[PDB]
Amino acid sequence: MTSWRDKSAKVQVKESELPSSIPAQTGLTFNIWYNKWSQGFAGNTRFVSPFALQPQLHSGKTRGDNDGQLFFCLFFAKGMCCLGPKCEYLHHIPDEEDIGKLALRTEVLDCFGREKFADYREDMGGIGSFRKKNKTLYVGGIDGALNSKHLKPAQIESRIRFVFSRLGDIDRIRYVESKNCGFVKFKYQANAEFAKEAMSNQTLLLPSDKEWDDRREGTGLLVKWANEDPDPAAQKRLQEELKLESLNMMVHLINNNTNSA
Amino acid sequence: LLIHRKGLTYLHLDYNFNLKPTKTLTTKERKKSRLGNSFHLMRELLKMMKLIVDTHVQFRLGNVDAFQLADGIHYILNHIGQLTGIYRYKYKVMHQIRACKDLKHIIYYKFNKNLGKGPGCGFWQPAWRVWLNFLRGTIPLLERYIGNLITRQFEGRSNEIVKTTTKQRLDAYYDLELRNSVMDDILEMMPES
Amino acid sequence: DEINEPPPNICEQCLGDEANIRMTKIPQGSECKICTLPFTLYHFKTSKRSNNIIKTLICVRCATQRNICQCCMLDSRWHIPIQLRDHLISLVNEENVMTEEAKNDMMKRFLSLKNVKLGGAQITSDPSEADNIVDKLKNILLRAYASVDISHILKKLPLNESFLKNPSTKSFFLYNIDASIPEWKITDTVSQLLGIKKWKDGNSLSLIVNHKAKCGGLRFQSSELGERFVSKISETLVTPKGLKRGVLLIDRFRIFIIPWSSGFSAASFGTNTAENIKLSLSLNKLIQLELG
Amino acid sequence: HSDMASKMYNTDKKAFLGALKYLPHAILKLLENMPHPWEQAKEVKVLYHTSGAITFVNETPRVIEPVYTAQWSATWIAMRREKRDRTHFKRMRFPPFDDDEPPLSYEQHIENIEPLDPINLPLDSQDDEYVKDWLYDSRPLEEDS
Amino acid sequence: HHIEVVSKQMDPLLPRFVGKKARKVVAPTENDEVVPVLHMDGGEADPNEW
RNA sequence: GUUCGCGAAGUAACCCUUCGUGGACAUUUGGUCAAUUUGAAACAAUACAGAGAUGAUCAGCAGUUCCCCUGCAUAAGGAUGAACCGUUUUACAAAGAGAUUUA
Numbered sequence A: 001m002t003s004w005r006d007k008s009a010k011v012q013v014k015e016s017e018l019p020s021s022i023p024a025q026t027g028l029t030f031n032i033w034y035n036k037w038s039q040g041f042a043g044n045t046r047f048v049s050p051f052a053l054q055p056q057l058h059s060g061k062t063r064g065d066n067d068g069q070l071f072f073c074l075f076f077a078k079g080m081c082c083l084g085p086k087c088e089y090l091h092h093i094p095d096e097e098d099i100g101k102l103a104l105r106t107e108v109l110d111c112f113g114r115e116k117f118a119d120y121r122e123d124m125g126g127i128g129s130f131r132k133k134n135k136t137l138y139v140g141g142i143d144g145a146l147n148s149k150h151l152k153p154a155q156i157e158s159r160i161r162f163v164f165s166r167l168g169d170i171d172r173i174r175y176v177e178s179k180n181c182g183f184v185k186f187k188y189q190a191n192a193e194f195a196k197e198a199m200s201n202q203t204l205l206l207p208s209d210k211e212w213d214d215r216r217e218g219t220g221l222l223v224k225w226a227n228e229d230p231d232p233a234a235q236k237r238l239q240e241e242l243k244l245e246s247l248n249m250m251v252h253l254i255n256n257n258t259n260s261a
Numbered sequence B: 001l002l003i004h005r006k007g008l009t010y011l012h013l014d015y016n017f018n019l020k021p022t023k024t025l026t027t028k029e030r031k032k033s034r035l036g037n038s039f040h041l042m043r044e045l046l047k048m049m050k051l052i053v054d055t056h057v058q059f060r061l062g063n064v065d066a067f068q069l070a071d072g073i074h075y076i077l078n079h080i081g082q083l084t085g086i087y088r089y090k091y092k093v094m095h096q097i098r099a100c101k102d103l104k105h106i107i108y109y110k111f112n113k114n115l116g117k118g119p120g121c122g123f124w125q126p127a128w129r130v131w132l133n134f135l136r137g138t139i140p141l142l143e144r145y146i147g148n149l150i151t152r153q154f155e156g157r158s159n160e161i162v163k164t165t166t167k168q169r170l171d172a173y174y175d176l177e178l179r180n181s182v183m184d185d186i187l188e189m190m191p192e193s
Numbered sequence C: 001d002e003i004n005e006p007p008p009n010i011c012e013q014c015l016g017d018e019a020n021i022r023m024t025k026i027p028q029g030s031e032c033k034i035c036t037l038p039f040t041l042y043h044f045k046t047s048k049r050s051n052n053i054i055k056t057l058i059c060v061r062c063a064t065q066r067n068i069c070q071c072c073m074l075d076s077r078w079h080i081p082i083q084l085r086d087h088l089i090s091l092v093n094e095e096n097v098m099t100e101e102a103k104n105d106m107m108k109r110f111l112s113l114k115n116v117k118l119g120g121a122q123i124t125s126d127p128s129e130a131d132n133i134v135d136k137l138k139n140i141l142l143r144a145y146a147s148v149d150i151s152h153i154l155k156k157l158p159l160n161e162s163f164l165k166n167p168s169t170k171s172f173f174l175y176n177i178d179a180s181i182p183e184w185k186i187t188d189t190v191s192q193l194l195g196i197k198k199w200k201d202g203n204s205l206s207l208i209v210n211h212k213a214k215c216g217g218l219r220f221q222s223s224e225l226g227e228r229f230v231s232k233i234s235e236t237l238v239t240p241k242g243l244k245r246g247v248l249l250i251d252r253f254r255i256f257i258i259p260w261s262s263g264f265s266a267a268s269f270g271t272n273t274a275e276n277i278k279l280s281l282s283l284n285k286l287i288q289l290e291l292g
Numbered sequence D: 001h002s003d004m005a006s007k008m009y010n011t012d013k014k015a016f017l018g019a020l021k022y023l024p025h026a027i028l029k030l031l032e033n034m035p036h037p038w039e040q041a042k043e044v045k046v047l048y049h050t051s052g053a054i055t056f057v058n059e060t061p062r063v064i065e066p067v068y069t070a071q072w073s074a075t076w077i078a079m080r081r082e083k084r085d086r087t088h089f090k091r092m093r094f095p096p097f098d099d100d101e102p103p104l105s106y107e108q109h110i111e112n113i114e115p116l117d118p119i120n121l122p123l124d125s126q127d128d129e130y131v132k133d134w135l136y137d138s139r140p141l142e143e144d145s
Numbered sequence E: 001h002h003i004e005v006v007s008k009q010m011d012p013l014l015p016r017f018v019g020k021k022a023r024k025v026v027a028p029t030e031n032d033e034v035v036p037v038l039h040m041d042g043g044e045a046d047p048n049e050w
Numbered sequence F: 001g002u003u004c005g006c007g008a009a010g011u012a013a014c015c016c017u018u019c020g021u022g023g024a025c026a027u028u029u030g031g032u033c034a035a036u037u038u039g040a041a042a043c044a045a046u047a048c049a050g051a052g053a054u055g056a057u058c059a060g061c062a063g064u065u066c067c068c069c070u071g072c073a074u075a076a077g078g079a080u081g082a083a084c085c086g087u088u089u090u091a092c093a094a095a096g097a098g099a100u101u102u103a
């Protein structure tokens, strides 16, 4: 409202300021059908995103708000949407009002409208599976994200707690130092889907740090879907919530047979 | 787009529709980069077409006079066998090439009465009709020829390829039927087990 | 059979409220999400002026074997997901029912061409065999690290100060947080208490909870909110030495608070997972010392 | 559609590729509608795909046969007069453009320049007075009811 | 719900039947009822002649 | 916006202008599709091998396979296109002897 419904959304990137559609050259000739480079050895082919979402800044009213759009702007999350207030999709962090609109639709596709798949991608990247309502993100690749700062084991967790808190309600944040990775669990799946594309290929530099001019040279942090949590301290919490989900559904389900009779 | 969808980015197709490899090719690349008659025949039609259209561009730009233009088109339509090399892929076109040569002999000696041997003769109409009738014959052909090619790109080869009997595999197929017939008759004789 | 094909299975809530729906049939449209084999893609819109096309994602054979609609893939009766459906039937028959799906492309295509039902699709699509299990759901409702040197950290946790009105602080120390009770549930309980709802717009409160150390802290901006957080909490526990502690009250849980009187930050709770477990083990005695 | 590097052209690349079987027909409709030597420029009516895939020339060249026979005959005489009284005739070289350079666009280059003088017999105003006005039109006597 | 079913005007250049590929599928066998192999019983004596 | 009316005012003298107000005309586009990394082309290069009968050296043509590639192809080629070359135990009884049990 005061942060979001008050203003209109602003143009994040000018359309001339958009990146070139051809990728960085990793080959000898450019392939026209598959927009890639062909006679090349290899490449890491991952780079730091030049753009980022300032959530309290860039959010605002858009065209899809008046049109009743259900889906969020994918580029708004990448910090790249050049249409601004003229864009068909939404430009704000998902709320309980928004996800209630998505409740019939979230089952088969994400908050960005992209259709989910049968099983996960092999590396647990990408869009996701409709067979599992996964709400936990695997924050990886932090070493290239920090541009090889040591910093602390636990000041790493502070930056992760700071950034992902802007992107929605959080169930928990767990950082593992020996594996050098984080596990962020959200209240809703829709925020996790939103924060995943928001935080892919980002950096955690915090401008005040000395490497802020070389935020671009680094790698960027992988945000991937997370696996199941292997300790039985968490396993028993899963069947506890699955119990409570079942009890909340049976009450809803006997009322259907009440109306059926 | 067709070349690059097949992954053949090392073949360069220039603007005059000549197809040349950009590097020395390994044998696995030479097998993959073999393009059929339907691809090249389609290319040679465009190479014939662009060669005509470029002369009308040359006339319109002002480099070429209208008498040079009409002679230029008449030089094209008579020498397509020499200019383009379409024959290699559809050798029936030698009927149209030897027809355009024969019309060239008829036209010149009625044209060059009381004139010397010289380049300029622009009566391209007789030779024009021969190509248009050749185009008429190959429109149903290439639409079948490329229509199989493009669906092979999008859908792939059918897994149900059944080889007809041919002169090369007749002696093998004669043996397969012979072993089956002997197998069936002996197995009926057998009481059990 | 390519000239004799079933009508599509779609929910009522995918079709929506309107009477007549113009639906577009494409005879070999997309391929199925499940069996990866082509089918008749039906797609439609709820109203004429809508802005979302609702496609059928799976084929009718995958929709029949699971007894789900093709669009939202929820169950045709009960309108619940498949994972929750096969779990509810598991509590009735006392055995695990489960539809299992192949990861293999030759064994996704194989499993669809068979005419069986999978999982709870024998129980559902039989109305007699579904209503009696709902009756059997109703009887269920009638039931209704000792080597660690932790001493550097516990100096910084307050643990010896009282929850009075008189200190004016921004930060607080929440301990006795279970491994359940998600970080959003503690911010919503505080914001319900102050009426500072939609707090994430203005950033009125910032909360860090570890869930291994069973401890946390919540920071306020604008310290005058701190007296609103103190005064809106009535129930407190006095330790039998003294040193009264307020209780936040998440449903069935109790979370104790002491004014930090400085900003705790991240890593106050622990800098290693093995190290944080001992702080919960450190606290468990003090909770028992506070109560008993 | 000169450089389809974007993701938006994924369907339009398929439209280029599926149009390849119809290309042969498009060459015929182009070459049958070619401007004859008495015409500077010819405005043809084209049918095109909305993704710019293929451009068929949607006409058929109809001519009046005694008019058409006269028109070639006039140019037949005009070229026999020309070859007689030219000091040197320079036949243009083939191919006219190098293969490395792209085909130059119509509008930056062709459209602005004045065309040229087409092949015309000079004519006699006393002998050819009935036809001299309309003999070299694009479609002769098209508007005359 | 009464649902009108209509056909989409296909683009003649784009490949019709976009899901049609040349793939290979192995089919299961539907065996609900066993077929009794109804021979007769047993002229079964035999020397080593075969 | 046009056209047919009706009304008011003004210029008029039943015409012109103005704005009030009935009509009529025209009536629901598009998307299976969002703009680079995370929903998927493939090559090449590096390292290690290195072409079926066999004693050696040469032609092949097939078959089977939930492998295909090039080709317009039901032609042909792809090393005879490749993969085959392993593992291997019960529908089992009838006769004739010495040790060990059983109760």
Ligand SMILES: O=P(O)(O)O[C@H]1[C@H](OP(=O)(O)O)[C@@H](OP(=O)(O)O)[C@H](OP(=O)(O)O)[C@@H](OP(=O)(O)O)[C@H]1OP(=O)(O)O
Pocket (backbone or CB within 6 Å): B079, B101, B104, B108, B112, B116, B117, B118, B119
């Ligand atoms: O070389 P020849 O076989 O003896 O005949 C040539 C040849 O025509 P043909 O190859 O069809 O016979 C010339 O054509 P090209 O071979 O160079 O293509 C042609 O002149 P053009 O080059 O203009 O066609 C020329 O005749 P002319 O110079 O009158 O045009 C004609 O020799 P003739 O003088 O006997 O016709």
Ligand SMILES: [Mg+2]
Pocket (backbone or CB within 6 Å): none
């Ligand atoms: Mg062979």
Ligand SMILES: [Mg+2]
Pocket (backbone or CB within 6 Å): F079
């Ligand atoms: Mg050999």
Ligand SMILES: [Mg+2]
Pocket (backbone or CB within 6 Å): none
């Ligand atoms: Mg060979």
Ligand SMILES: [Mg+2]
Pocket (backbone or CB within 6 Å): none
């Ligand atoms: Mg073979």
Ligand SMILES: [Zn+2]
Pocket (backbone or CB within 6 Å): A073, A074, A075, A076, A081, A082, A083, A084, A087, A088, A089, A090, A091
């Ligand atoms: Zn946008």
Ligand SMILES: [Zn+2]
Pocket (backbone or CB within 6 Å): C032, C033, C034, C035, C036, C037, C058, C059, C060, C061, C062, C063, C112
């Ligand atoms: Zn299916």
Ligand SMILES: [Zn+2]
Pocket (backbone or CB within 6 Å): C010, C011, C012, C013, C014, C069, C070, C071, C072, C073, C074
């Ligand atoms: Zn549904």
